[PDB]
Design a protein around this ligand. Sequence first.
Ligand SMILES: CN(C)c1nc2c(Br)c(Br)c(Br)c(Br)c2n1CC(=O)O
Length: 327
Amino acid sequence: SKARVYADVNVLRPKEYWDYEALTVQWGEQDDYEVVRKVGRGKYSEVFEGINVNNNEKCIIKILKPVKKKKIKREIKILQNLCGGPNIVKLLDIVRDQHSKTPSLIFEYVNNTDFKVLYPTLTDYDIRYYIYELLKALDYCHSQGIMHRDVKPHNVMIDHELRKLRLIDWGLAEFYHPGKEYNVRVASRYFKGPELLVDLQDYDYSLDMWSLGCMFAGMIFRKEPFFYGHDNHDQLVKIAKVLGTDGLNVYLNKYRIELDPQLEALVGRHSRKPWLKFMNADNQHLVSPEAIDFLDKLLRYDHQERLTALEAMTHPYFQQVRAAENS
Ligand SMILES: CN(C)c1nc2c(Br)c(Br)c(Br)c(Br)c2n1CC(=O)O
C-alpha cells in the first residue's frame, strides 16, 4: 500500500531534510527561560508555563525525561521542518542543564482550555471552524512528508478567545517513505486506526484521518471517546460493532490479512449501525447530514478510501468557514 498523495516528497528532496540522525543541535541559553508553574505532563516530559527573561513574554517549557539521542532528534528535526506552517506549534529554542545535560524544548505559549471543559461549550459553527483549522495543520505536515501519528483532542491546544489552534505533541511524528513498514504501536488507543489494530504496517498519512474522524465523532455525538475499547483487541471490537463486520472482511481480504484466531473470535459478527443511531436530544443540534456525510468519508476501514486532508477542506460541511476566510 502506498499514500495516494505526497508519496514522494522525501524521495526527492535533499537527504538533509529527512536524515534527522545527522542533525546537530544549536543550544540556546538555559538562563533565558524561567519556570512559572506546571501545566501538563506526559510519559516523556513535564510541561511548564514559563517566562522569557529578556522580553518578559510567556512561553512553554517542555522538560524532557531521559531520552535516546535518535528519538529526540527525530522530534526536533520534525518541529524545525514544520515551524512556520499553519497551526503547527512553533519550537522557538532548545536548551539544556549544564550538570545533568537534561534538555528542554521551548515553544510558543497557548492559553489552552482543557477540551473536556471546552468542547461541551462549542457551537455547531465553532466545531466546523476548529476542525477546519486542524485540517490546515494536517494537510501542511502531510505535504512536508510527515505523519503526526497521535491526533487526539489532548494534543490540540486552543485559545478560544483568540480562536487560535495549535497541533502539539510531535513525540510520535515520523517521516513518510513509500513501502516502509512502520511500528503499529503509535497513536493513543481510542484513536488507533484499524490498520494499527490488524497489524498492517505499511500505512501512511491516512492514519491521521482516522484519528481526526474519531475526534470529530466524539465532538458531534458528545460521546468521548467515541470508540471506548480497553485494550487493543477490544478497540477493534468496538469499531466492528459500529462499522459492521462485512466491511471488515472486505478490507482484510483486499490487503491479504489474517486476524489472529482469538481476535477473530472476540470480533464475532455484527451488522453495520447507521450513524443516526447515535443521535439523541443533547447532540441533535450537531449531527446534520453534511456532518454525517463528512464523518462517514473519514471513518472507513480502508485507509486508501478515506478523504485526504486537502479533499476534506473542500467538503460542503465547511463551506461557511471557507466563505468567512474568503472575506
Ligand atoms: C504535556 N505536553 C506534551 C504538552 N502539553 C502542552 C501544552 Br498544555 C501546551 Br499550551 C504546549 Br504549547 C505544549 Br508544547 C504542550 N506539551 C508539549 C507538546 O505538546 O509538545
